[PDB]
Design a protein around this nucleic acid. Structure first.
Lengths: 41, 141, 129, 185
RNA sequence: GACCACGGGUGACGGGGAAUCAGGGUUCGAUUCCGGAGAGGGAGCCUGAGAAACGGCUACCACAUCCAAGGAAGGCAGCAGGCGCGCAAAUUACCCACUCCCGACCCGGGGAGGUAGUGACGAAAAAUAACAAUACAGGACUCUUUCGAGGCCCUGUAAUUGGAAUGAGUCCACUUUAAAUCCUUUAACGAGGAUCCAUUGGAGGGCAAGUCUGGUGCCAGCAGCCGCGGUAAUUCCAGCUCCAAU
């Protein structure tokens, strides 16, 4: 009954955090997004 | 129809005060009975002791077994049911551990598929349960 | 250096205290705040007086540097300056020395001497030894 | 009993309807035009514009012949003229409500510096200002949001101490010169 | 005394006043301001102009300090600090220099006050990167609208370097300060992935984002409302990318 807690969390593989270049912060990010969205098709 | 005369203001204040005892929000707060009746006693949080670990069935449309904890509050000794918010934190928490209990929402009403359950669990053994879930901290040894 | 110049404002002579209150402005293009010793020397040089009865304090520098504003007193006599001056300001240039005892110790000795009566000196000797 | 202020106030009001797509685009376009850091500065400058707009509304609703109306009215025109969001030839009480938030953004030090040509870009102006290279009235101003009075409009120039105006080398120039001298020797 | 007495409750000291806003208004008021009350409780009192006073005393009630057992000596809802209730609040610091106050009186005292230590608790002002020509994808234009070429500004590329600029922190000095630190300057340092790595929650709506890829398969969970879960889940757990505030 209470033994199935967190079953899915432990079952899925623990994919390591991939290396992503740091994104601009503050003023530079605001200017960048103005110059330029998640078209997954 | 409603009175409009210029020398009836006392009637206006009386009719508004004796009809203010007719709405579920005003009368609930200004009778002093709701605050004496909730196990919190007007508390946004509370330090209680984990007594029992139980599994409660979800509502009719959902077939789920939530992980609630029966906790007795140190302030007045009320036995309440408090579901553990995040996944995997039921195994993170253990019995005989002091925890901090917070709200579910809806101003003291049951939220989601957990019937009769209004309480959430955080600050397990003086470390945040969100911290334990994210791995920021660990239980003291 | 011929770059740092001293100006004054709000000049008024107070013969009641035998001094001359001023507001000292220092203009330096690319240097930091000049030491107070140099401020006293230069101001006394242009006032044709000695840099001994002159006291300066309270120098604040404007944002970005350059301009500093402060207070200056030019006492007529050294004896009058000693009579009319806060003791800490006198100790800045070395004219008075304050007691080295701590306020905590003075309170402790005051309490002990308040407990006794007739001979307050008796507890003073034992406490200091 | 303490000797301090206990006095402050809020400068910006969060919009009642946040995440509105229309206002998000307008604020983003304003940010991309004047080089704003974020939306808070918009919330602030629009608030100051809103406040003197409300003062105009209350001033309008006042009676026709009021010395206090003329005193507060003309005084508000003198300020708006000397900051420069309103023309001097449009001296009228009703014209106050016609002001625009973008017009207020035109009067910033960063925008005025970019318009005068001291910097190649608006963000270049903000970088230089944050780095203390622009001075007005022989005083370095490091606030991009600092408001320049229309009277002191022609008194913006590079500082006499900065490497741009004065020409004194900095950390990078000294290190490069010393490395070259060492290699040559 | 029905124009609401008498009574009770209050998670009530009052008010000058605080949040919010078409307007009318709804709530909160100990707080640092002006008055009242209290110094565990309510009793009492001598001096003093002014006390029914608690950093005065007496007695009683709980608590409890020392005792040589014959007594003595008590009230931190004062400043720190401690214990107990608690989701919920600071250093057993320095000084009378600023503010004023007390005293025979300029010279002494003030946990009143000022300063420092903690302080994402609130209110601001604010760094975390700007440019160049290269190659491509290109955008805005000019001749022609024919294969289309050429010329000025702008966007993107852990692709190319560069020039000058800059603080965050080392840091001799100066300055402020009763004596000290930061803040305001100045010497020498200090950026290339400038790694000197901004974060909290989502990707159905309200309110801005994914019919992206996996694991799981109405179980875990998510989910404020509907609802999302029987194998190819846009809502579950992971990776990438976008959305908001910073």
């Amino acid at each position: 009954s209470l033994a199935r807690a967190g079953k899915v969390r432990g079952q899925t593989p623990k994919v390591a955090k991939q290396e992503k270049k740091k994104k601009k912060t503050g003023r530079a990010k605001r200017r960048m997004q103005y110059n330029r969205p998640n078209a997954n098709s | 129809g409603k009175c409009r005369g210029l020398r009836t203001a006392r009637k206006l204040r009386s009719h508004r005060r004796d009809q203010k005892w007719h709405d579920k929000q005003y009368k609930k707060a200004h009778l002093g009975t709701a605050l004496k009746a909730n196990p919190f006693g007007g508390a946004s949080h509370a330090k209680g002791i984990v007594l029992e670990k139980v599994g409660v069935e979800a509502k009719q449309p959902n077939s789920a077994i939530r992980k609630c904890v029966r906790v007795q509050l140190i302030k007045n000794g009320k036995k309440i049911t408090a579901f553990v918010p995040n996944d995997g934190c039921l195994n993170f928490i253990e019995e005989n551990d002091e925890v901090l209990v917070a709200g579910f929402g809806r101003k003291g009403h049951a939220v989601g598929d957990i019937p009769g359950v209004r309480f959430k669990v955080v600050k397990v053994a003086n470390v945040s349960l969100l911290a334990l879930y994210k791995g920021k901290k660990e239980r003291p040894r | 250096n011929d770059t740092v110049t001293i100006r004054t404002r709000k000049f008024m002579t107070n013969r009641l205290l035998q001094r001359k209150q001023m507001v000292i402005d220092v203009l330096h293009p690319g240097k930091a705040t000049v030491p107070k010793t140099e401020i006293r020397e230069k101001l006394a040089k242009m006032y044709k007086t000695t840099p001994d009865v002159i006291f300066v304090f309270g120098f604040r520098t404007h944002f970005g540097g350059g301009k500093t504003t402060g207070f200056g007193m030019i006492y007529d006599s050294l004896d009058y300056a000693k009579k009319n001056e806060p003791k800490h300001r006198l100790a800045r240039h070395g004219l008075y020395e304050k007691k080295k005892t701590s306020r905590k110790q003075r309170k402790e000795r005051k309490n002990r001497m308040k407990k006794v009566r007739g001979t307050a000196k008796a507890n003073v000797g034992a406490g200091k030894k | 009993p303490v000797a301090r202020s206990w006095v402050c106030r809020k400068t910006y009001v969060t919009p009642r309807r946040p995440f509105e797509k229309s206002r998000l685009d307008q604020e983003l376009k304003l940010i991309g035009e004047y080089g704003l850091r974020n939306k808070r500065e918009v919330w602030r400058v629009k608030f100051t514009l809103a406040k003197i707009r409300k003062a105009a509304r209350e001033l309008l609703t006042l009676d026709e012949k009021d010395p206090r109306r003329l005193f507060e009215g003309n005084a508000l025109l003198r300020r708006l003229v000397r900051i420069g969001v309103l023309d001097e030839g449009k001296m009228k009480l009703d014209y106050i409500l016609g002001l625009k938030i973008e017009d207020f953004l035109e009067r910033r030090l960063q925008t005025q510096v970019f318009k005068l040509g001291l910097a190649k870009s608006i963000h270049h102006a903000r970088v230089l200002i944050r780095q203390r290279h622009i001075r007005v009235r022989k005083q370095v101003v490091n606030i991009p949001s600092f408001i320049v009075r229309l009277d002191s409009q022609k008194h913006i120039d590079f500082s006499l101490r900065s490497p741009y105006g004065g020409g004194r080398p900095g950390r990078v120039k000294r290190k490069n010169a010393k490395k070259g001298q060492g290699g040559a020797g």
